[PDB]
């Protein structure tokens, strides 16, 4: 399932590719949010792009995004949300 | 299949004057279109239910129930119709409905259900729900249906059903197969409350083989009422052969129901 | 007889806060596709099929918002109204209802997610009334899209012609025609790993442009791959690359 | 300048490492905003973490943040800003 | 003898909107250091030296805010006050001014940026007054910091004892002790590139815990390095690895 | 190093009464500490300027300017003082200042400027600015300084300066070195407007070598006023040697200024 393409956006061309899932809700701005899930447990190889390389680890990145909610007409409230943006390649941690 | 109770059926739900009727079926196809065709129902399900009769005869019944859809189409609703179809016997019944009063979406829930139909065991059941007026030609469908699997009476819950005992499974014949003398076997077992003949099929097979050296049939005459619930004893002489030690003996009733088709109880004796 | 009248608005819809007792149906069907207008720009063609047989006796408009996610974040949408109410459930002339709108300009190498719902919207504690589709834009490597200003400035139009031959056992000679656009180039040689590497700086050649770059190589360089990377300023470090091959020089 | 460490946070351990620069202002919330300027033109090698590997490319990622400004007392103005979060390792595009 | 009373507040300072005719100086000196409380938490100890000889005749307080950035974003800060009015430049008792405040909790593997300025703040079209310092926290590989409940679940205190010897030319056997925390592990062998690979699944062994894992290898595997990676659920994919070495098992 | 002339000096700025004065300086036992001494100045710079004179003695002067910070310390300001210090000769002079009335920060900009002092060419000048009261012992300093470089005579604007006119670089001698007969050289050049003697230093070197075969000195007596700006002709007999064709001839004056130290003009003749 771990593969690297040749063209298109970064998600299909990054060493640590990420897909987009769907977070549906009725009272949120926007209605649909798209998080990122790292499909490969490790970083892919540079020479080919279709195989895996175990010398790496995959981690997500998060950031707070301003969204709005309603709550009882109705009332408008503001609250942040935690949404994943992109997976990056990080080096292992060793002990010994 | 047949309707159970002729008492005035109750479909009353808060704020409605509903009637239930077994009108003409016409299967599920009919032509009577009009201007506006309301929307389709939602979340139709059927559940298993058990109930007795005035005599106490416990019959199996189905708990058909379904929900609605939320839209303005509820304003133009006029009627509904229920159908039951049989795959094996192709006999189909029908249920008619209506709504004498118009409905407004007032509280955000509306439920329908019914459990007034007896089902037969081990038969597939098809139930379809339609809404009136019927669709205009070349229109979106407004009917949904699903299947229904019914087990056999040998299941514990299906066991206690009243219709079962007419050629049923609760009647366990205590099978006593004794080696007795050489080349002779004596079999004793209890029989049920019906004055219908039985039959014993004694088949002998060689060990580790399905072929039969010797097969014998014994006919048991029609029981008398005084002989009900009393063990019947039959002795049979076996074949004088070596290696054909495996013997299969089975009993087959010929009750009024499932005649020639009821289940057989087979006992295996190995040496 | 209704038609479509599209404008633009991003933010809170005034009818969301207010409660509605009767709601419409949904979008029965929805398709999107790209259509190009030229003498550059590409626009979006989205077509939808309306609800059937019911749930339309009351309806006002529809909203379509689209999110693009590649090296950025983008979100903007346009809500359109319907001029006249609906009396019937299918077109009297014949066929199902079908509307469309053209707009929403497209960038390059960005994935778009398109969603819509009907108006007024569903109250709280009800089913999800949405349906969505997805669509990916073409890149810059394609033949049709080689002539945009950004790509040509990054060098899509450029024809860097390369002739690299094995000079000797340990060095290889590369010839390539320069450009007034750039002045510095890299060099990569890949067979199984790096066998050579260099960095060059030459100005523009109004003179004859046949290059004279010599690069040291480890081991037999026959049958390797020559990859050239230009340092064009406008594409930063992500500038398109071109292939080259190793030939034998008598 | 192209090195990968063993411990610490991601920016000292990621294959495409980035450093933080200083943006100063007197009428911004916050006063200081720290962008990302990742160093090496190409991604680093996994086997050692101290040299460079040219097969990859580096690219910043951007996201919109909420900041407030002053304008004439004073006035409350709300508009977004462009900041850089982290670079990632992307694959090249080759033509021909 | 002035003292500093500190409380928490994040957002717009009310003095920013208003206009001030006269402003104070800036912070002359600033230092940030970490402290550890006896049992388990980590707090940062700050200290600042107030301006000298002037510009302190009028002053109210000193705000500090801190931004941390690692796999996350963070921003929260406290404006802390002063109680007494200032009549002189240095201490009447002698020496310069040395204040401090303890707080601002500390996470793991997060870089911290500390900034501050004096109150009230500079008006529009004036010089940039502030000064800032940076600080970094240790990880979970140091001896003094192996005992958070957070990092123990990742296996900081684990004692995975390992023994890997070369069974034959193409096979190397790995012996190691299991744990009730883990169920699945990797196996990586690195000399120049991958020479072998595997993936194993075994539950906790309340019996004897000497392992038996067979991994195929390519070429001479002598002198390679053996790394193990456990799938402890708490750490996800960032679970710490423990090194190992390959020895020679003699047939004798 | 000397003030240009004595005239009521102008330092006034809007909303300020100012006085200038030269008096005792050098901060000999200058320990005068008071309670709360204002802050330090900000952005002090010195520029170059040329000022004419009534009789024509164009002079180069240094334009010193500086700004102020914007702290509350401006309330307690009382005074200032300027110092100019020489490095080689250590001769040094000061000028004092004062602000008669208390200044209130109304608008955000304040500047102080002054260029009424003549600097000497090609000298290093140090300018220091102090504020009153003076600092308490063990206190934050409130004085800043800078170094200033002066170009020499050959600079384009420094050419026309009259202190440079004294022993003028503008005195350009048309050097005419004629080979004439063998082992003889004739040189003619113009001289300046002072009765100061000139010494001709004729040195002959071999080609591609710095050693000297023959070195001769000629004394030109003190010129009369009638001979000013008239070419002086001196002929010298050269050494009768082969290969020592390179000849260096240099001329230096003994003017009233830079006596024994004024620059020399050397002309090289190569064969
Ligand atoms: C790439 O450049 C080379 C060199 O300019 C071209 O080689 C020329 O080939 C033609 C034959 O078609 C010869 O007549 C010329 O003499 C060659 N050039 C030189 C300088 O000798 C080559 O054709 C170019 N290829 C492309 C695709 O541009
Ligand atoms: C690449 O370019 C170089 C010069 O930039 C070419 O080298 C010349 O080739 C001609 C062809 O006969 C010779 O006459 C010259 O003596 C060569 N040297 C110079 C300095 O001109 C070379 O031929 C080109 N092609 C290749 C494949 O290297
Ligand atoms: C790791 O485990 C091995 C085996 O489980 C330990 O080896 C023991 O070593 C001692 C002496 O060093 C012997 O007396 C035991 O018989 C060994 N145990 C065996 C053979 O099962 C080893 O001590 C452990 N620790 C380390 C650091 O290797
Ligand atoms: C690694 O573990 C294996 C078994 O898990 C050990 O093999 C045992 O060796 C002893 C003698 O040392 C035998 O009595 C046992 O029968 C063996 N186990 C089995 C299952 O047969 C091995 O000694 C361990 N250490 C290594 C390989 O270095
Ligand atoms: C709707 O009803 C009108 C009667 O006023 C009729 O003329 C028309 O044909 C009907 N349309 C449909 C689609 O049934
Ligand atoms: C058999 O006998 C009765 C009468 O026919 C029948 O109704 C019943 O099912 C059986 N009796 C019992 C005790 O099950
Ligand atoms: C069958 O045999 C058993 C035991 O020998 C006896 O109890 C029973 O009465 C017999 N039944 C008949 C019908 O003879
Ligand atoms: C729909 O009507 C509203 C009400 O006037 C208007 O604000 C909105 O812009 C319209 N939508 C368009 C023009 O797309
Ligand atoms: C985010 O920033 C980009 C920067 O160009 C801007 O174009 C866009 O309008 C901003 N907002 C959204 C929602 O994308
Ligand atoms: C959009 O696409 C449809 C079908 O693909 C086509 O009929 C129509 O002409 C296109 N353009 C517009 C403006 O609808
Ligand atoms: C995106 O499009 C593909 C096309 O087949 C579809 O299978 C997938 O579900 C879509 N993704 C989402 C999140 O809807
Ligand atoms: C600092 O002073 C402000 C102004 O009155 C006050 O609101 C705030 O609570 C003070 N901070 C403390 C007491 O920690
Ligand atoms: C961002 O979201 C996190 C959620 O864990 C929250 O703790 C934090 O206060 C939010 N704000 C900042 C500036 O980090
Ligand atoms: C903080 O550090 C300073 C500097 O050594 C020290 O004097 C002080 O005791 C520490 N703790 C506090 C609470 O100030
Ligand atoms: C971080 O601290 C070091 C201390 O030597 C300093 O050199 C560096 O400039 C600081 N970084 C920033 C962004 O201020
Ligand atoms: C400041 O003035 C007060 C006024 O009484 C005096 O007591 C004090 O000694 C002064 N400080 C000095 C001279 O440093
Ligand atoms: C030389 O003569 C006078 C007197 O010394 C002097 O002032 C003047 O500058 C000189 N003459 C010229 C033409 O410069
Ligand atoms: C020097 O010689 C030139 C030309 O021979 C002549 O014009 C000039 O008057 C001579 N000078 C003197 C002082 O005689």
mmCIF file of C-alpha atoms in Angstrom, chain B residues 57-182:
data_model
loop_
_atom_site.group_PDB
_atom_site.id
_atom_site.type_symbol
_atom_site.label_atom_id
_atom_site.label_comp_id
_atom_site.label_asym_id
_atom_site.label_seq_id
_atom_site.Cartn_x
_atom_site.Cartn_y
_atom_site.Cartn_z
ATOM 1 C CA UNK B 57 -52.085 -22.773 21.640
ATOM 2 C CA UNK B 58 -48.734 -20.990 21.342
ATOM 3 C CA UNK B 59 -48.155 -19.951 17.736
ATOM 4 C CA UNK B 60 -45.139 -18.203 16.176
ATOM 5 C CA UNK B 61 -45.777 -14.722 14.788
ATOM 6 C CA UNK B 62 -43.711 -11.937 13.234
ATOM 7 C CA UNK B 63 -43.232 -8.393 14.572
ATOM 8 C CA UNK B 64 -43.277 -6.190 11.470
ATOM 9 C CA UNK B 65 -42.490 -2.535 12.207
ATOM 10 C CA UNK B 66 -41.224 0.462 10.264
ATOM 11 C CA UNK B 67 -40.429 4.167 10.559
ATOM 12 C CA UNK B 68 -41.073 7.277 8.466
ATOM 13 C CA UNK B 69 -39.015 9.806 6.520
ATOM 14 C CA UNK B 70 -38.875 13.507 7.336
ATOM 15 C CA UNK B 71 -39.962 15.824 4.506
ATOM 16 C CA UNK B 72 -42.969 17.823 3.348
ATOM 17 C CA UNK B 73 -44.270 14.673 1.624
ATOM 18 C CA UNK B 74 -45.904 13.701 4.925
ATOM 19 C CA UNK B 75 -48.517 16.347 4.120
ATOM 20 C CA UNK B 76 -49.687 14.476 1.001
ATOM 21 C CA UNK B 77 -49.724 10.966 2.496
ATOM 22 C CA UNK B 78 -52.988 9.093 2.048
ATOM 23 C CA UNK B 79 -52.536 5.371 2.631
ATOM 24 C CA UNK B 80 -50.430 2.248 2.946
ATOM 25 C CA UNK B 81 -50.613 -1.445 2.106
ATOM 26 C CA UNK B 82 -48.905 -4.557 3.458
ATOM 27 C CA UNK B 83 -48.151 -7.724 1.501
ATOM 28 C CA UNK B 84 -46.708 -11.128 2.397
ATOM 29 C CA UNK B 85 -45.263 -13.424 -0.267
ATOM 30 C CA UNK B 86 -44.194 -17.069 -0.084
ATOM 31 C CA UNK B 87 -41.294 -18.359 -2.166
ATOM 32 C CA UNK B 88 -42.129 -22.066 -1.876
ATOM 33 C CA UNK B 89 -45.941 -22.117 -2.109
ATOM 34 C CA UNK B 90 -46.350 -18.857 -4.094
ATOM 35 C CA UNK B 91 -49.455 -17.992 -2.058
ATOM 36 C CA UNK B 92 -49.524 -14.263 -1.179
ATOM 37 C CA UNK B 93 -51.855 -12.368 1.165
ATOM 38 C CA UNK B 94 -52.395 -8.632 1.517
ATOM 39 C CA UNK B 95 -53.227 -6.083 4.209
ATOM 40 C CA UNK B 96 -54.906 -2.739 3.552
ATOM 41 C CA UNK B 97 -54.484 0.457 5.563
ATOM 42 C CA UNK B 98 -55.501 4.118 5.459
ATOM 43 C CA UNK B 99 -55.390 7.385 7.397
ATOM 44 C CA UNK B 100 -58.835 8.888 7.986
ATOM 45 C CA UNK B 101 -57.227 12.119 9.230
ATOM 46 C CA UNK B 102 -54.457 14.219 7.728
ATOM 47 C CA UNK B 103 -51.122 14.337 9.548
ATOM 48 C CA UNK B 104 -48.810 17.240 10.365
ATOM 49 C CA UNK B 105 -45.206 16.755 11.429
ATOM 50 C CA UNK B 106 -45.747 17.829 15.021
ATOM 51 C CA UNK B 107 -43.534 15.703 17.244
ATOM 52 C CA UNK B 108 -40.345 14.441 15.637
ATOM 53 C CA UNK B 109 -41.260 10.750 15.704
ATOM 54 C CA UNK B 110 -43.839 8.427 14.167
ATOM 55 C CA UNK B 111 -43.951 4.644 14.515
ATOM 56 C CA UNK B 112 -45.896 1.792 12.903
ATOM 57 C CA UNK B 113 -45.933 -1.910 13.808
ATOM 58 C CA UNK B 114 -48.022 -5.070 13.536
ATOM 59 C CA UNK B 115 -47.810 -8.685 14.771
ATOM 60 C CA UNK B 116 -51.050 -10.349 13.682
ATOM 61 C CA UNK B 117 -49.761 -13.006 11.287
ATOM 62 C CA UNK B 118 -48.622 -16.578 11.965
ATOM 63 C CA UNK B 119 -45.604 -17.820 10.038
ATOM 64 C CA UNK B 120 -44.592 -21.328 9.117
ATOM 65 C CA UNK B 121 -41.239 -22.714 10.290
ATOM 66 C CA UNK B 122 -38.358 -23.178 7.845
ATOM 67 C CA UNK B 123 -39.975 -20.900 5.248
ATOM 68 C CA UNK B 124 -38.687 -17.710 3.661
ATOM 69 C CA UNK B 125 -41.048 -14.761 4.096
ATOM 70 C CA UNK B 126 -41.238 -11.633 1.933
ATOM 71 C CA UNK B 127 -42.919 -8.491 3.272
ATOM 72 C CA UNK B 128 -43.312 -5.297 1.244
ATOM 73 C CA UNK B 129 -44.685 -1.910 2.301
ATOM 74 C CA UNK B 130 -46.323 0.467 -0.169
ATOM 75 C CA UNK B 131 -47.704 3.984 0.129
ATOM 76 C CA UNK B 132 -50.734 5.506 -1.551
ATOM 77 C CA UNK B 133 -51.237 7.108 -4.032
ATOM 78 C CA UNK B 134 -49.155 4.776 -6.187
ATOM 79 C CA UNK B 135 -46.340 6.236 -8.322
ATOM 80 C CA UNK B 136 -47.137 8.142 -11.499
ATOM 81 C CA UNK B 137 -45.721 6.351 -14.580
ATOM 82 C CA UNK B 138 -41.954 6.821 -14.857
ATOM 83 C CA UNK B 139 -41.474 7.798 -11.224
ATOM 84 C CA UNK B 140 -39.202 7.036 -8.307
ATOM 85 C CA UNK B 141 -40.051 3.901 -6.292
ATOM 86 C CA UNK B 142 -41.779 4.085 -2.920
ATOM 87 C CA UNK B 143 -41.616 0.489 -1.654
ATOM 88 C CA UNK B 144 -38.988 -1.557 0.180
ATOM 89 C CA UNK B 145 -38.860 -5.168 1.310
ATOM 90 C CA UNK B 146 -36.582 -7.683 3.006
ATOM 91 C CA UNK B 147 -36.236 -11.382 3.812
ATOM 92 C CA UNK B 148 -37.007 -13.477 6.893
ATOM 93 C CA UNK B 149 -35.279 -16.681 8.018
ATOM 94 C CA UNK B 150 -37.266 -19.009 10.287
ATOM 95 C CA UNK B 151 -35.463 -21.905 12.035
ATOM 96 C CA UNK B 152 -36.744 -25.436 12.631
ATOM 97 C CA UNK B 153 -38.646 -26.692 15.669
ATOM 98 C CA UNK B 154 -35.541 -28.468 16.997
ATOM 99 C CA UNK B 155 -34.423 -25.066 18.292
ATOM 100 C CA UNK B 156 -35.342 -24.529 21.934
ATOM 101 C CA UNK B 157 -37.625 -21.533 21.397
ATOM 102 C CA UNK B 158 -39.188 -23.027 18.263
ATOM 103 C CA UNK B 159 -39.625 -26.260 20.236
ATOM 104 C CA UNK B 160 -42.317 -25.039 22.630
ATOM 105 C CA UNK B 161 -44.566 -23.850 19.806
ATOM 106 C CA UNK B 162 -47.994 -25.479 19.695
ATOM 107 C CA UNK B 163 -48.064 -26.186 15.909
ATOM 108 C CA UNK B 164 -44.857 -28.214 16.253
ATOM 109 C CA UNK B 165 -46.229 -31.189 18.198
ATOM 110 C CA UNK B 166 -48.325 -32.157 15.212
ATOM 111 C CA UNK B 167 -45.399 -34.174 13.841
ATOM 112 C CA UNK B 168 -42.992 -32.358 16.159
ATOM 113 C CA UNK B 169 -39.561 -32.549 17.755
ATOM 114 C CA UNK B 170 -40.403 -32.474 21.480
ATOM 115 C CA UNK B 171 -41.408 -36.123 21.068
ATOM 116 C CA UNK B 172 -38.061 -37.726 21.869
ATOM 117 C CA UNK B 173 -38.252 -41.519 21.428
ATOM 118 C CA UNK B 174 -35.899 -43.073 23.962
ATOM 119 C CA UNK B 175 -33.928 -45.398 21.689
ATOM 120 C CA UNK B 176 -32.713 -48.576 23.405
ATOM 121 C CA UNK B 177 -30.608 -50.732 21.071
ATOM 122 C CA UNK B 178 -29.326 -53.854 22.831
ATOM 123 C CA UNK B 179 -26.742 -56.242 21.400
ATOM 124 C CA UNK B 180 -28.827 -59.158 22.776
ATOM 125 C CA UNK B 181 -27.999 -62.523 21.122
ATOM 126 C CA UNK B 182 -25.663 -62.893 18.182
#
